[PDB]
Each structure stands twice: as C-alpha cells, then as structure tokens.
C-alpha cells in the first residue's frame, strides 16, 4: 500500500523524479504483484528504486507468474531500466536469446530505449509477449 508521497521520497537523488514516480504508479496499479522498493544495487551506497515481484505471462493457454526485478536508474525515463528474471528455489533460468546466465534480460525495447516513446508499461507488454513465446524460467523437472 505505497503512496506517491513515499515514492517521491525514494527517488530524492533521481534526475527525473515525478516522471519516475508517475510511471511507477502506473505499473503497480496495473501489475498488482510488482512492488516498489528502495534497495542497494551492487554497492551498499548505490540505492535505487526497483520494482520486484511477478508479472502474468500466458504460456500455451496457461498463466504463469514470472518473477522479475526492474531496477530504475537515477536517469529513468531517459535511460532504460536494468531488468532481471529472479528464479525461486523451484525453477531455473533458461539462458537464451533474451536472457543470459545471470538472468539479465535483453530486449530490442531496452537496447533502443528512448523517452518519450519508451516506458515501463510498454516494456512489460513486450515481456509478456516475448516470455509467452519463450519462457525465461522453467520449473525443476
């Protein structure tokens, strides 16, 4: 149950604060299982807001809750987020075209990202289509 006021707080060091907050609100409103959190990325001092949780991905007439983490850089939305698939203990990363060994996601949408054409809602829409065709994680057989 986060609020825009709290989100603005998390992005005090960001270059485009309202734009980041506005899009975060749009994302967590449509995708109920994505939660905003202020955490450290790589270094304890590199605090950034990220959206963690799952997104609904239909795969062959069945919906799966794919675990992801979207790190919003302090330059969002002018630079793309850094995205990862976060496998749980019951699954394994499927390294392939759009996902590397570390679970980092690669997509044309991210590679050519540019404001205002690119946004998080558009990105997640792409993920749903792409992952629906080629799941980035699979359950342990």
């Amino acid at each position: 149950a986060v609020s825009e006021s709290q989100l603005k707080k998390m992005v005090s060091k960001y270059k485009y604060r309202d734009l980041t907050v506005r899009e975060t609100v749009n994302v967590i409103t449509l995708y109920k299982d994505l939660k905003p959190v202020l955490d450290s990325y790589g270094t304890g001092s590199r605090e950034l807001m990220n959206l963690t949780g799952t997104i609904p991905v239909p795969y062959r007439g069945n919906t799966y809750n794919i675990p992801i983490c979207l790190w919003l850089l302090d330059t969002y939305p002018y630079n793309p987020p850094i995205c990862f698939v976060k496998p749980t203990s019951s699954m394994t990363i499927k390294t392939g075209k759009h996902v590397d060994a570390n679970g980092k996601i690669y997509l044309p949408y991210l590679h050519e990202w540019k404001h205002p054409q690119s946004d998080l809602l558009g990105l997640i829409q792409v993920m749903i289509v792409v992952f629906g065709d080629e799941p980035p994680v699979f359950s342990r057989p």
Binding site: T54, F138, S139
Partner: peptide, 9 residues
C-alpha cells in the same frame, strides 16, 4: 500471487 514457471519439454 506465488511465482510459477512452466514445466520443461
């Protein structure tokens, strides 16, 4: 609301 993934082929 629990993470899930499809079974392998």
């Amino acid at each position: 609301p629990t993470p899930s993934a499809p079974v392998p082929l």
